[PDB]
Symmetry: C4
Subunit: 389 residues, 4 copies
């Protein structure tokens, strides 16, 4: 075992293959499955695992009532074997709280959870299954983090955190960890105006985090991190192809250095992109308004070119079905000469879009890149809401 | 650990002993057991596992309604400890999709699943739990494979795949893998006219696959594969003892080189045979029309002699009970000087034969050869359908 | 890691301490617990496990109806971590059948199950999780075995099997296994007239099997096996303290070399004793008529003296509660200079004694010896039958 | 791989961070969660586990009725992965009985359980999952122990046990174990007048046990143990800050050498403190009367100063929610230069305080020390009792 070094380039991606799907809500209609949200995946030398924030109740349990709520003392980050659904029986509690990230450095797994009241939240940083560091709120307003995996290089795992308003300028920091100890803290710099819920990946010595501007932009901010120097820059995705939700129609040109505003009725969703010159892919909901559908668009030079448009697309979830959050991960320990992009889509069921039930939960689908031109279909959740009425 | 080499001959078999039985439908009437079909078993150096395609719901769940359907985005290949019933709590997702095969090469397990729409399916080939290779449909019509284990020799594991019509000429290939990477692809050669759902085993450096002709024949095709030269031949089982379902009455003579037509109402079922001169055994349903009952027939020189008939019989599932698919496997890592034939029978319950429930599922029974003359009884599923009404 | 040898003496036993209790019926009133009967424990270098014959249904399932029946195609030998209750999720299928034994030889575990119809049963013998040997019925009448552990010495594990009538002379054999292979078969010799369901333990290079005479005797047969010579002798417990059920009142004098007849209404139950001169303990039901209560009696020289009576007692299960089978096991790999006796009691619930339910199952309690003088209370099952109405 | 030495000092503690919370009652409203009480945590070189006394029934089970009662033959000590809720499927049975302690010595875990009738209980001492020693009641009145973890130094693990009246002078002993074997027994000496339910931890070669005086004191006794000499002293916490329940108002001065009496209506609850001069923290229920609320109080020199009062506080459970037992543990195998204090609070639900249900159970929250000044919120159980009506 050795520390992961981000030595390899991204693999070429022409289409996406199915990696995993847990069918959590179909199964959970009858079996004992935990209510969750904010899922992701993360890998290590042995394979990949699913992660999510439990609501500390099962789906069919009476306590599922009220699980639209984001923050409670009953939430925790749980992990489990990829492809299984998350039950009380097969889930590892990583940390306690209602906002998380996790990553493996090649040696051990770091997991971070925030908990506490809005004005006095704190992070606990775990490494190798033991708590190492605690970080108090610096701005007194929902200290929070990625809700997908962090990335490590030579033992240094940067993590993007935000504390402050959802709907105004906030205080974002990049905290560089090693073995769960703080090596450096940086205040966000550059042109991104608001940062939440960063989806990060590493390639060729560089970490890129594609985030959520909940204040203004329907274009996604991008943080570019040098994990050796422990420095960063920020701006927006250049491309006119807008990938937040809600968003206005894609304009004639994007903006690399400022938010493109508009869209109704919601100010943002967690998402991701892989950015590698011609080899660039943007995910987004198919609906511009609602967390409905999910598509992958190949947008050459999305990172640098304001005129860049899609050259190919793959529907991941049809627009007659609910999506949710999406995020990046990579199996950095695959037996490949390149790092192959993967992503997941959270498939949210229940409130608020389906209000015939009292709960809010999700299932997971994940896909990874192929160089081939693979056929596709819709990987929607596949539960019948009427069965839960 | 080392690559398996198929150096041993097949064991002499005079009767069949019980290996495993999961009683899935009985247990699943109350416990949380996944709906499945297309089960099989496959072994490795440590022992044997059960496999099946989940339908992504439990048997008592409301989502079991409509599980007669073969292909959905909710299906996956799952494995579990031999003899347990498949629950959401004890099952490993091998890959996602609605047609599979799996085999261990002595080092690691290869698993393959096809998924996607009819006109644009793809396979993902996994090795040691990681995705290695993707394979797009070549004929745009339900790319599909064995539904039982593949077989490896010196790290080379041939797999039979078909893409094309169920009811007409299709495009079958033999794809030879090593550590999940394609070493060679062959188009089907020889006199078999249609190939599905091959049941394969190895002995003395030869792999023999006994398949389903869904187009014409009630006699089963046989593909003989040389995993070193990576070449093959094909024809039909010679014996007059016809083993597909539906089938006509056994004729006075079989046909080694052309399908024997007839039988109603169903064009085919997955089955198997062990072919070893005098030591040859043919499985089939007892009913010539329906997937009812299951019998083993010792048919010396079935592979070569059109006049060959049964010299002994063992009833596996009586003809008052439902059967289903059957397939071959061997514990190639047993401490014996010969490789001992094993087989399973899928015991399908529910639709279409039992239309008083809304679901279709199965349990498994598996048996292996004995040189002794063992007594026998019926290993039917054993659930009472009235309890599910 | 080596083959176990049985050279150590039995520990002094003055009282019995609680080892385990699984509370399976209390738990299974709501949780998914398998219906069982014929439990036991067996140990290995790592610890001890519980074992039993599943009925291939949960306790609360509709298929629990009719589980009074002893033999079906849906039974199997299952093992689980000591103390847990047996669910579909935590149980290992050892072999398939309706009569079993199991033991560890210090290297691997041998498990044997008989299955099939009454007139044509067979045993399959497993070693290290793989089938090794098959044994066809020799008398055409319910080939059957111990229902508690076997014992091994220097690789050789004798097992006592019976084939033949329950109510008349039968054909008992002692089969001596090594690595699941037959080393020697012996016909029952000596003065025991009928042998079933031997409870066996080793000490001082000698295996003693205390059995059930279902034909005539209310005294228990004792077979004494020499595992190095692979020879045996048989007779009856000499003591006047009669330990089968049903049995008459204890007479003035026992009978070492013939069955003492009498008792009503049942011809026998599986039981056990530890026979070590002054250090001898007999178990039995407290009721002479029914499988009610369970007591341990210290009966010095029970093996040799027809006049021997109890000098001390410990009630294990009060006579207001149901018992069942009882059997011997020892943790031969304990860090002691002597082998400490242990036993279990099967706590049978449901039919025929509790006929307000449709099922029959059991829970387990197990105790081992202490040289101390420990207090005691009843370890009855603890479920309320009313809750199952 | 080596015996734990208590060489390190305690860590500085300024606030408490969340370590784990199992949300057992919330989950157990629907999932198969065992009824427990008397929980704790204990760690080992790999991690930390949760522990509790099962009542041998699930929470939704009909046998949950009557689980207010403390002692039965259906209780056992169970352990499970920290953070999961205790189910029949994920729990290890450590020993059988109705009072326990457990600790790891660096090599293996010792677990002790008392069982039996009030007048004739006995302890069984387990090491590495095997029973080692038995200890009969010495005073014929509910032989009992800590209900939280013991502590080990150079292989020696002292354990505090009591036998005798709950409401009068009793017979307490300190038993010093190594590999589950009694090294030495001491009668309690010093000024503590009654001892129950000690909560113990180690630092700098000293073990301190902060206990429950059920007879007189609302101040807590403190036993100080040298595990090398295997000797002890006893007295009372000096501080005026009284930490038993029920208790009177804190007086002007505490008493180091005698109980401070009063309070209504209950004579005691298990609790804990960490005592390290200025770095001293006392836990107690917020209510002086009932097991309601939980607060940590930083009380410099609480061990030595009868005038010491609180300089900091942290509310762990608000006084609108039920608490219960509380106890100490440390992850002695953390990668830190100091031993970091941790504690748990048992969150009791059901009887007697919530009499609309028939049961009594609990969930667990656990927290460890931080040198930072972390914000806090209430970590109450979170279940809605109405859902169980
Ligand atoms: C302990 O259990 C064991 C384990 O099962 C059992 O041992 C078996 O014993 C029986 C004899 O009792 C053996 O049966 C022999 O089987 C031979 C082959 O039979 C198969 O093939 C027959 C021909 O089929 C072809 O042709 C016909 C047209 O003729 C056509 O319909 C077919 O489709 C096919 O083309 C077939 O007739 C036969 O059918 C029987 O079995 C099936 C199940 O497979 C059942 O569904 C049928 O209803 C029917 O029962 C079967 O499919 C056969 O050649 C042989 O016949 C000779 O011996 C008998 C005497 O036994 C003579 O009476 C007869 O004239 C022949 O000379 C016989 O039927 C079987 O092989 C043993 N199995 C093993 C593994 O050893 C023990 O009996 C059990 N003990 C107890 C006490 O129960
Ligand atoms: C087997 O499976 C293969 C895998 O899916 C499949 O291969 C696909 O083949 C199709 C058909 O040839 C190719 O389609 C091509 O895609 C590109 C790019 O399409 C995307 O972008 C355009 C432009 O969007 C922007 O501009 C418009 C208007 O100014 C705005 O509305 C928009 O927001 C952007 O600003 C967009 O119009 C496309 O819309 C389609 O798809 C979306 C979902 O992604 C739908 O919601 C929508 O209604 C519409 O159908 C799209 O988002 C396009 O420019 C080319 O002209 C061409 O259409 C796929 O790229 C290709 N995919 C891959 C991975 O190869 C095979 O077809 C399939 N075989 C069979 C037999 O089914
Ligand atoms: C703290 O715990 C200690 C251990 O748990 C416990 O110690 C026990 O103490 C008692 C004395 O108080 C000792 O009892 C002694 O027992 C022996 C043997 O008794 C057994 O056998 C006799 C004879 O049985 C035979 O003959 C009769 C008459 O013809 C027949 O009916 C029978 O079928 C046999 O042929 C028998 O009468 C006894 O019967 C009693 O026990 C049974 C259960 O086994 C009940 O069903 C029955 O109704 C009756 O109660 C018995 O079976 C006896 O000979 C001595 O005179 C004396 O009675 C225990 O041996 C001893 N045990 C151990 C393990 O040390 C302490 O009592 C306890 N302290 C408490 C509770 O305060
Ligand atoms: C982010 O969260 C932080 C962590 O919780 C928090 O930091 C806390 O801030 C508060 C407010 O500044 C601090 O309070 C200070 O506490 C000390 C200690 O007070 C405790 O003890 C006193 C005295 O108790 C004795 O005397 C009285 C008689 O006078 C008796 O009743 C009693 O039985 C004793 O003999 C006590 O009065 C305090 O009472 C408070 O707290 C309890 C719960 O513990 C409540 O039940 C009660 O109603 C009342 O609220 C207390 O028990 C005190 O002397 C100072 O004067 C000051 O009160 C916390 O210490 C501090 N905590 C930490 C860990 O740093 C931040 O406030 C928070 N930020 C925001 C924005 O919320
Ligand atoms: C339990 O099993 C018995 C045996 O199968 C069932 O009894 C049968 O029930 C049907 C329908 O009521 C009757 O017409 C038959 O006459 C009964 N058969 C026998 C052999 O008695 C019984 O119904 C089952 N009980 C439950 C609740 O499932
Ligand atoms: C809860 O358990 C109590 C105690 O066993 C039950 O109360 C008994 O119920 C039986 C049957 O109705 C009565 O005959 C007894 O007299 C009652 N005893 C006591 C001590 O009250 C009660 O029925 C159980 N409740 C539920 C819902 O199971
Ligand atoms: C820590 C926290 O509450 N995160 C929540 C996040 C947050 O409200 C937004 O990012 C504004 O800050 O939004 C959402 C959401 O579904 O949109 C769910 C998260 O649980
Ligand atoms: C991939 C797929 O759909 N396979 C299905 C297979 C197929 O329809 C036939 O082999 C014609 O191609 O048939 C059956 C069947 O019960 O007969 C079930 C399989 O799920
Ligand atoms: C293999 C088998 O049927 N064993 C059964 C055994 C047997 O009937 C008796 O030993 C006479 O042979 O008896 C009993 C019983 O509860 O008494 C249960 C066993 O399941
Ligand atoms: C072994 C035993 O019964 N312990 C019990 C203990 C005891 O009654 C008290 O310490 C006086 O001895 O009290 C309590 C309690 O909630 O107060 C619960 C424990 O189960
Ligand atoms: C089963 O599915 C059909 C097809 O969707 C549906 O209309 C019907 O109501 C379902 N039945 C049940 C009982 O859910
Ligand atoms: C029996 O086992 C013991 C302990 O392993 C060993 O030392 C002794 O040599 C063995 N004796 C025989 C004769 O095998
Ligand atoms: C622990 O104690 C042992 C035995 O006295 C001592 O030799 C050793 O140095 C100690 N090791 C650690 C690392 O605490
Ligand atoms: Ca936005
Ligand atoms: Ca056919
Ligand atoms: Ca008898
Ligand atoms: Ca359940
Ligand atoms: Ca007190």
């Amino acid at each position: 075992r050795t520390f992961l070094n981000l030595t390899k380039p991204l693999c070429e991606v022409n289409s996406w293959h199915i990696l995993s799907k847990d069918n959590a809500i179909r199964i959970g209609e009858d079996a004992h499955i935990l209510v969750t949200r904010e899922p992701y995946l993360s890998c290590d030398p042995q394979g990949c695992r699913m992660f999510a924030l439990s609501q500390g109740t099962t789906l069919r349990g009476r306590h599922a009532n009220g699980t639209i709520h984001d923050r409670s003392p009953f939430r925790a980050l749980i992990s489990w074997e990829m492809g299984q659904a998350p039950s009380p029986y097969n889930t590892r509690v990583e940390c306690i709280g209602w906002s998380s990230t996790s990553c493996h450095d090649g040696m051990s797994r770091m997991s971070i959870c925030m908990s506490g009241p809005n004005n006095n939240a704190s992070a606990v940083v775990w490494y190798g299954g033991r708590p190492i560091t605690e970080i108090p709120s610096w701005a007194g307003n929902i200290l929070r983090t990625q809700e997908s995996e962090c990335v490590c290089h030579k033992g240094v795992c940067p993590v993007v955190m935000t504390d402050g308003p959802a709907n105004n300028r906030a205080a974002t920091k990049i905290i560089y960890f090693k073995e769960g100890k703080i090596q450096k803290i940086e205040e966000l710099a550059g042109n991104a105006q608001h940062i939440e819920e960063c989806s990060c990946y590493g390639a060729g010595g560089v970490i890129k985090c594609i985030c959520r501007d909940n204040w203004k932009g329907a274009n996604r901010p991008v943080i570019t991190i040098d994990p050796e120097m422990m420095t960063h820059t920020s701006k927006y995705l250049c491309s006119k192809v807008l990938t937040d939700t809600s968003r206005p129609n894609d304009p004639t040109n994007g903006n690399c250095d400022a938010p493109i505003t508009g869209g109704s009725p919601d100010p943002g969703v967690k998402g991701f992109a892989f950015l590698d010159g011609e080899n660039s892919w943007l995910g987004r909901t198919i609906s511009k308004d609602s967390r409905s559908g999910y598509e992958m668009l190949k947008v050459p030079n999305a990172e640098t070119d304001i005129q860049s448009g899609p050259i190919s697309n793959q529907v991941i979830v049809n627009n007659q079905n609910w999506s949710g959050y999406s995020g990046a991960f990579i199996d950095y320990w695959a037996n490949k000469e390149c790092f192959n992009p993967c992503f997941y889509v959270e498939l949210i069921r229940g409130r608020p879009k389906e209000s015939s039930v009292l709960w809010t939960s999700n299932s997971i689908v994940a896909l990874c890149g192929s160089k081939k031109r693979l056929g596709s279909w819709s990987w929607h959740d596949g539960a019948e809401i009427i069965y839960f009425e």
